[PDB]
Each structure stands twice: as structure tokens, then as C-alpha cells.
Amino acid sequence: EKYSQKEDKYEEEIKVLSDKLKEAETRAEFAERSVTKLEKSIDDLEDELYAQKLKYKAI
Amino acid sequence: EKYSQKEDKYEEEIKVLSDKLKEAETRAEFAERSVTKLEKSIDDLEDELYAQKLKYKAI
Amino acid sequence: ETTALVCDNGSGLVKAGFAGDDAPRAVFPSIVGRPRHQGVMVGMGQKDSYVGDEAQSKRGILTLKYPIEHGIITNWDDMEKIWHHTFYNELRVAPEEHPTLLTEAPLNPKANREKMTQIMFETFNVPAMYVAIQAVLSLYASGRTTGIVLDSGDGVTHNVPIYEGYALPHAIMRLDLAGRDLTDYLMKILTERGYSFVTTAEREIVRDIKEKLCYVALDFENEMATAASSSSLEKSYELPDGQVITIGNERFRCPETLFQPSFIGMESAGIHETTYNSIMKCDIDIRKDLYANNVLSGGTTMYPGIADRMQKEITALAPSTMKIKIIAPPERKYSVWIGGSILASLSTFQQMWISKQEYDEAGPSIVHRKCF
Amino acid sequence: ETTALVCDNGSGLVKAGFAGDDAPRAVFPSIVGRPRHQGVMVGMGQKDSYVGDEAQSKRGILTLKYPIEHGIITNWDDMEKIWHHTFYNELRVAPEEHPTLLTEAPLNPKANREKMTQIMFETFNVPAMYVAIQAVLSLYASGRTTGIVLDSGDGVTHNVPIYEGYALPHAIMRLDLAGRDLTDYLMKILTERGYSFVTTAEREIVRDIKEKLCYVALDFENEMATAASSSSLEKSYELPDGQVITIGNERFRCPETLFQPSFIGMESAGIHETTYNSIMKCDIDIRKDLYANNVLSGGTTMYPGIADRMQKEITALAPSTMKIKIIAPPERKYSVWIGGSILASLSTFQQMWISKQEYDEAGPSIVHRKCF
Amino acid sequence: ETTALVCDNGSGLVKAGFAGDDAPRAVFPSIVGRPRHQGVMVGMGQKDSYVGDEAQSKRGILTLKYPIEHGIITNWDDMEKIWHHTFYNELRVAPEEHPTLLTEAPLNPKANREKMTQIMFETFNVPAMYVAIQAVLSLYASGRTTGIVLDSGDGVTHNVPIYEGYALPHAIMRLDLAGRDLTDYLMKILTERGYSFVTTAEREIVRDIKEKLCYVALDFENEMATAASSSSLEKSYELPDGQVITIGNERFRCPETLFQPSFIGMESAGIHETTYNSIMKCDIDIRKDLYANNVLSGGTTMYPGIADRMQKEITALAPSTMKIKIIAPPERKYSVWIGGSILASLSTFQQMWISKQEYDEAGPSIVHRKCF
């Protein structure tokens, strides 16, 4: 009786943990893409700041 | 016994998912913190970029 | 395919039968008898020795002795009479047609493995044979390939960790204390209550009592207190010749010696302790399967309520991030024999048997090349 | 463009996949396993060797050995089993259809360059292959053809100054100390705290610990003082079999050996020092670009807080008339591999492939005319 | 020079005495024990604990509990009873008059270094103490300040390469397998022969057996073959209650585990291998002196015929361009202690003493600033 009831709970738990893992991964993966997009913008700004330094040294 | 073998499996799966989830959580936790960090570095670089732009304009 | 005899060499009951069955077909006492008289029985057919239910029923003209004590064959000549009774009386078949699988303790003496190999092959003329550790078969009967068996027979207790069908030879633990000892102990502690039993005809009723009425307490001090505070921890037993005796706290005290060996003058550590001290010899990546797959096996583990006690005890010694769980098979008393039936009926195992030709080449020693 | 494999052959994890991807598609342990005993399993299939996550999970039967130790291929026979696992198990593709970009350590032995050429062509029957230097690739991943790559592996740290996409051979510094050594060192210093470890199953948890909990201090004396004055420089780790251990100052001490090689009894100079020295052996004109483009690569550089430490150290050795800035990729651990992908997916690289024809004519030695 | 005690705290025999002697004064079992029950002896004085030869004289009333296991103090409360026995019973002197040189295992836990500092100062009120590494002392006993000491205890084997009298921390190999383990192993393999020993009162005879009858074979396969082909590799031993037992191949098998740790499920490498490895982690220049000065120490090295085996093994791993020679002291089992005496009797060591004043100021932790 207990094994049936513990099975029921555990199926529910597995399901809740699995959906949670999948959600955590997609969002985590979206945040990594968010960083990659920010980084790209640091790189643009860094380059532009360097070009601005070459010009500034010149003039 | 079929329930005991499955039950066992369902616990082992719950552990493995709890463990896998927690690694996805720690990473997510880290992504939010990185974003906050980059936003601060971006602010700093934009500010330097403007300050360089003033200097270039000026001379 | 050749029908194997699987013969479990129990220190109190012999369990024997044919392979391809999931249950023993013969169960009889590990007892051998010889005449009180200077010859055979009066006016009846000649027998020099007697076994099992014949020795139990003809007892008034016999002296009785035991062939096996504490998981060790203590007389070859009587282990032979168990074997003679097994093939020709109980299963009524020629052994010379049927390969033999024999059960043994972990670390069973090599001189013994050989005298067993030799006796089977020369006298019985077996076509092929094998010898296998009790716990290794009980793991197969538990439906699992990796785990640890607490095997407690009618005479010895072992803790045996196993990986994919091989027992780990550095990690095994042994305790001589189980069902044989348990009867002699029970008998002592009943004399102490004032139910003196001094005769071996009483010892076998004390054995039956033990099997029926003993129970493993979940908490030793709390049950002990309960019996001291109230007589509700006592069950009556009516002896065969009338006379109602009352069995008290002896019920849980008797098996208590398994957890505390110092009660009977031993220096050894308890069965739960030797479970813990066994698993901690193994690799961390396999400890997960060992602690999760703690299997109870053998006749001594059939006392009710044992799992909750063992669950307790092991979780107290072991860290609370190894998963802890007691596996108790539905008919754990037979799980060695059932695992022997499974092993003897695998298709890949048919290459493992000792053949009569390999015995003719290397003598009884072939068991140390074919077996482990 | 015919799909190339990029196999970044790391000293602790192999990173492998298909070109045209900006990320590895298999990331698994650089481990190979072989049986400890005669006979492996009962009632199941068995085989002579195991690799990666199969060797990590089926562990109880296995001795474990490695293809690569300190960035140096140390056993051809295990590098082969990693390769066999890579094509047929992990990516489940025929290598004979797919050109292969192999990565090599800066200044890898020529006899090794050749045995790798030969083994890929004769056994795997690759159509084509090229060997490219791991650092050189890590720079292409950062979008430059000028800068210094400090590639600090799971086993070797190299400083390679690159100008115009050309590695400068006179200024290549190889330093054997990084992630392999770092585990063995961590384990030592934990025994010293009284958390003794001895089994290689423990060493791989110590490895995991190192990757999770180590951090590069910005100031070594000030953090050391902090840990001596307060227990706030300690993080708990619960081992996989329960038992909570506390990891102290070992967190920053472990990687501290990279800055001060004397702690492990070396005559070597530190990573920072070797970077400075690398730039000083280089042409006067380019040194500004190298300091300004100190590009971090590999698994050992993924400890937090590395950049502020490296920024410090390099500005202290280098003139303040040269611009100094640390460039740390978003996923610097994969920089080698990523760079292989970008390079191997280039149309210009297609003419750079060592064909089988070119193999058939000159033997394994052809590698040295096409790859520098 | 104020008379110092040298207390070589072995895992099976404690060795104690006064400095200025070239030999230990008292050598006694590393055992402590406590009564099995409240009320166990009549007509004589009961005690809460018993130690060494006093415990061994009347062992039956005691549960033994061990002060040291595998070169680690595993119970403080019993190490204290060894110390109490040492000063007041065996040397019959006030410790508070006598500086104390304590020996420590190579890489002993720091929390242990401290609890030892503290216990000596607060309870015994020592004037002064120093803790010196046991291997480091064994080399001073051989009259050098350069070589390797393989100190193989009654419980732990360590390889410590020493140059200029300085232990090299990066190249210290600790291997838990030696004399403690060796008894438990010997006992297992005797049960396997069918001489089952299950009681710790038997294990101490098995210990004695081991010390008397074990010998290191020069060639393991050839001696093994000899014992399989003839019974000339067997020596009789008459047990202390009669009964002649025969000890076979177990004689050389028991110590064989030191060369092949896989025989008892360990993942570690052999003593020879660890010596070779120790020298290879050391500076290139000194490796000639270390091979040439492979100095043997401790109780486990007193098995006959060790040198020819060790000479062999080390020349096979090591280049023939490096000089190889085993140095075996005349009484190598005392080397630790003897070295303590020489050191503790030095005028230069008198300035090295941790005074009570230095204790009062910094607590037990002072040990780590004065002792390395």
C-alpha cells in the first residue's frame, strides 16, 4: 500500500523535477545568450574606444 | 518486488534530478550575477567612451 | 539440457532439488544416525546408518550426530550420508546423470573444497560439478547484479559485497554466530529461567521454538523494559508431552547476541557493525549500490521485524547521504538455493562446470581454477 | 565544405564535435579502463576495455589510465581507445567520411606529431587531416590574429605570442603545471589538513572540488591573512557518500603554485613572469599589442577572479607606457575547440588539408611540411 | 644538556627512553584496554584502564581500544594512557623535569600535531618539547643528511627524500600498508588455508608469527612455484596451548601485498614504485644520491632477505646510469628512536626547543612555526 503511495508521489516528484530541470536549462541557456549579446556589445564599445584612443592621440 | 525495484529507481532518479537541477540552478544563479556585473562594466565603458569623445572633440 | 542438482549444504536443514525450479523440492534435517545395538535392527533389512526423517522417527534405537557445524563440514563420513540420502532416497535419481552445484561459506577452507570435489567425483561419479558462495547466489535471487548480502544461516553470518556477480575478496566479513549457536544459547537462558533442558531430544524442540517465537526487537532497551514492567512479551508453548511452558524475554534476547557478541564471551563485532566495516573497504562510485542494495539472506533472517531494526542500525553507522534501504526477499531462507537454480540454468554458465576429465587431469584441485 | 571534426584532445576532458558549430557537441572525461582480474562479469556480456562515461560508471572492475599526461601523449594504445570511442560511440559517425582537425600542444614532440599522423590515416582511414596548435586556435576564437595566448590546460600552460597569425617559436614558453598537477597538489594539502585521501576514486572528487571551489585571489598575503584571522574563507562540500568536509585556504593555495612554482620544488618561473618574458623576447614594436591582448584560454583559467589578479601582476612587471588589458572569453574553456571550428570551416583551409595521397608519398613526416 | 625523552610512538610497539643512549630503554605493545563489566575482579584492585604489558598480563577482563592506527592517533584518551604508563610506570620519572622529543609520521595531520602539543604541555607539564619527523630521524641515525628513507612502520610506509637534512614536501609518498594491515591480512589467508582464526586473542599470536616467520622473497613467482612443487617453503609453529600448525606460502605472500597493493583491493602503487616515483619528483641533480642512499627503516623492514629484493626492484625501475645501493641499518627497527637520541642530544637542538613560554603565548599552534 505504501509502495503504491510512495510510487504516486515519486512520479509526481519526478515530473516536477524534470519540468524544473528543462525550464532551468532553457532559461539558463537564454541568459548565456544574453551574456553573449552583452559581451558582443563590450567588444564593440572596446574597439570603438580604441579607435577613439588612436584618433585622440593623433589629434 | 517490481514496485520495490521501480521505487528504488524513482528515488535514484529523484536524487540524480535533484543533483542535475542544482547544477542548473547554480549556473543560472551565476548568469544573473554575471549580467549585473556586465551592466556595471558597460556603464563604465560607455562613460569612458564618452569621456574619450569629449577629449577627442576638445582638441 | 542436463538437469542440475542444486544442493544447499545448510548447517541445520538441507535444501535440495532440481534446477529449472524456482523452489527446493526436498527439505530435511542435517542429522545422521547409527545403531545403539551391536548390529542392525531386529528382523528387518540391513542399514549401517540413518538420515533425515528416518533418523528422526527411528531415534529410540539410534545415537545421532551432526555432519556440518558452523558452515564447516566437521565430518566427511556423515556429509557423505546426507549426500547418499539426497540422491537415492529423497529425489530418487542417479546423480551420475545430473551435474551438481554445491553451496559454501565465503572463505570455506581449500582443503574442504577439495575433499568435497573428490568425494563427489569418485564415489557418486558426477558428470560435472561447481561450488558457489552462498551470498553470490542470494544476490541473483534478489534480481540485482551489484549489492551486498548479509547472509545469516543456521550456523554462520557473513557480509559479502558483490560487483556484477563477483564478490569483492578484500571486503568480505565473517561471524560464527547464527542459528546453531542460537539454539544452544536459547537453551542456556531457559535453564536460567528455571526451565532446565539438559537432553538433546529437548534441544531440537528449543530449536523449533526459536524459529517460531523469536522476533527481532526494533528497540532492545524498550522491549526489555516492557517485559520487566509487564508480562505482555511472553508467548506460551505447549511441549509435545503436554505441559505448558511460558517463553519470556528470551524471545528477543536470543537473537540479541547477533548485535552484541560480548553477551556470549566473543571478541567479535556485531552483524550491523561488520556490514558497515565491510562496505567502507569498497570504491566510492560503487558504495551507492552497496548501501542501497543491502540484502538479507538465510534462515536466521526470517525472524519478523528484522528490517526496521537493521534499517535503523545501518543508518546510525552510515552517513545520511548514502541511500540506505533493507532488501528482504519474499522467501529469503531459500534465496541461496533459488540463485543456484538460476545460475545453473543460464546459457553462458554451461562453460563454467568442472568436467570429469579436468578432475582426472588435475585431481580435486581443479575447483581453484574453475571456481573462485 | 566536408564536415570536419574538431577533436580538442584535453589532458582531463576530451572536447569533440562537428565543424560549423560554435560549441563542442561531446564533452567527456579523458579516461580509459582495463579489467583488474581474470573474468569481469557473471550472467552478462563483457569486453576487454572501456572509455569515458562507461569507464566512470562501470568502475568497480577497472584500472584507469589516460591518453594524455601533461599535454604529452603518453600511451598510444589509450589515445586510440579515446579516438575509437569518439567516432563510433559519441558522434556515431564514420571518421573515414570526415576530415579531422587535431589540436596539438605548442612545441609537441615531432615523433608524437608523426605517430598521431600515422594512427589517424592507417587505422581510422581519415580522408584528410591537419594538426593546428591549440593556442593559435584560441586566438582565432577571440577574433584576432595578434596577441598572446596563455593556454593553461588540464595539464600544461603555454605562452605563445602570435603576430600576423604566426606563432613565434623563440618566445614560446611551456610550463608543465596546470590542472592535472593541481589535483595531485590539492590532494596533498588536504591530507595535511587531516582530510587524508589515497584512492583514485577520491582523487577524481578532489578534481571536481578543485573546479568548483577554487578561486584566484587578487592578493595572496591578504586572503591568507583573512583565512588565518577568521574562518570566512572556507566552503563546505558534502561528499557523495555523506560526510560533510570543510575546504579551507586550500582553495586559493592550490592555484597559487601557478604564480610561485617553488611551492612544489621547481626552478620554473611563474605564469605571469613567463607571459612578461614572452613579450620581452618578442620584437620591440609588437609588445604593445601583446600586452593589450593577453588572451586567456583553457580549463585552468576558469577559476573566478583571475583577471583582476593577472591584470595586476602583468602591469607590475610591464612598463606603464604599454597598455595592459586581460581578455577573458565568455566560455574560454572551449576556446581551442571553437577556434578549430572557425578555422576548419574556412574555405581557405581546405587547400591546407594533408590528403591521403600526400600521406602515401611521404609517410607520417608530411605533417612537418604542412603544419608548423 | 637536560635529559630528553625520546618517545618513538610506533603503531604496534611504543619505543621510549632517555637521550644520550644509543638504544631504547623500554619497548612495549601499543595497546590500551578498559573493563568489560562493572565488577569483574575480586581480592585485587580494579582500574578504569590498563596499558601495555600490564594489560597483556591479564588481558581477559578488557575490551582493547587502540591509541594509534595506521600512524594516526585515532583516540586521544588512549594515547594519553600510553604516555601516563611511559613516564610513571616504565621509566619511573617526572616528565615535567625532562624535555620531550616526540616523533611524528611524515605529513601527520595538523589538528593532531596541535592536540599532541596541547596534551603534553597542559597535563604532563613538560618544560619543553619538539616534534620531529620519524624518517628524518632515521636518516640521521644512518649518518647522513642526504638520501631517501623508506620508513615502513607497524602500520604506515612513507617515502621521504631528504636533501641537506631538509624533507621535500612535494615528493613525500605516504602509503597506508605495513605491519598493522599485514597481521589482518595474514589472518585472512590462514583462514583460507583452513586455520581459521576469528578471535583477537589469536590475532596477537598471528602478529608474533608474522614477525618471526615472514621473509621477503627475492623472486615471487619462483618461490611461489617452489611452494606449489614441494613443501619445503613451510615452517611449523607450536601454538601457546599445544597444537602444531604449519605456516605455508603465507610467509612471503603476506608481505607480497607491499609490492602489489591490488591483492587487497587498493588502487595504490607498490613500495618500490613509490620510491622510484619519489626520486623522479625530486630535482634532477640529487637523484644519484637518493638511489645510492635508499635507507631502510622501521619494523616492517626487518624481514630477512629484503635488500636483495629491493636492490632488484629499484635497479629495474631506475636507469643503470644512476648508482643503486640498499642501506640497511644493523638495528633498523630502532632507527627512528636512535635518530631522536642523536638529535635531542645535540647542543644545537637546544635552541630549537618549544618552551612553555612559547606555548603560553601562541597555544598548541606554535608547533607549526618551529617544526616543519
Swiss-Prot record, chains A, B:
Subcellular location: Cytoplasm, Cytoskeleton
Residues recorded as bearing Phosphoserine in the entry: 41
Positions of post-translational Phosphotyrosine modification: 50
Induction cue: Induced in stimulated quiescent cells.
Disulfide bond entries: none
Leftover remarks: The sequences of cardiac and skeletal muscles are identical.
Subunit record text: Homodimer. Heterodimer of an alpha (TPM1, TPM3 or TPM4) and a beta (TPM2) chain. Interacts with HRG (via the HRR domain); the interaction contributes to the antiangiogenic properties of the histidine/proline-rich region (HRR) of HRG. Interacts (via N-terminus) with LMOD2 (via N-terminus) and TMOD1 (via N-terminus).
Domain remarks: The molecule is in a coiled coil structure that is formed by 2 polypeptide chains. The sequence exhibits a prominent seven-residues periodicity.
Family recorded in the similarity comment: Belongs to the tropomyosin family.
Reported function: Binds to actin filaments in muscle and non-muscle cells. Plays a central role, in association with the troponin complex, in the calcium dependent regulation of vertebrate striated muscle contraction. Smooth muscle contraction is regulated by interaction with caldesmon. In non-muscle cells is implicated in stabilizing cytoskeleton actin filaments.
Name of the protein in its database record: Tropomyosin alpha-1 chain
Lineage: Eukaryota, Metazoa, Chordata, Craniata, Vertebrata
Gene: Tpm1
From Swiss-Prot, chains C, D, E:
Ranges in a coiled coil: none
Tele-methylhistidine modified-residue sites: 70
Organism: Mus musculus
Residues bearing PTM Methionine (R)-sulfoxide: 41, 44
Name of the gene: Actc1
Main location: cytoplasm
Reactions catalysed according to its record: ATP + H2O = ADP + phosphate + H(+)
Residue numbers bearing the N6-methyllysine modification: 81
Keywords: Acetylation, ATP-binding, Cytoplasm, Cytoskeleton, Hydrolase, Methylation, Muscle protein, Nucleotide-binding, Oxidation
Protein known as: Actin, alpha cardiac muscle 1
Post-translational modification: Oxidation of Met-41 and Met-44 by MICALs (MICAL1, MICAL2 or MICAL3) to form methionine sulfoxide promotes actin filament depolymerization. MICAL1 and MICAL2 produce the (R)-S-oxide form. The (R)-S-oxide form is reverted by MSRB1 and MSRB2, which promotes actin repolymerization.
Similarity comment: family membership: Belongs to the actin family.
Role, per record: Actins are highly conserved proteins that are involved in various types of cell motility and are ubiquitously expressed in all eukaryotic cells.
Compartments (UniProt record): Cytoplasm, Cytoskeleton
Top-rank taxon, per record: Eukaryota
SMART domains, alphabetized: ACTIN (SM00268)
Subunit structure: Polymerization of globular actin (G-actin) leads to a structural filament (F-actin) in the form of a two-stranded helix. Each actin can bind to 4 others.
Family annotation (InterPro entries): Actin, Actin/actin-like_CS, Actin_CS, ATPase_NBD
Pfam families: Actin (PF00022)
Example of a GO MF term: hydrolase activity
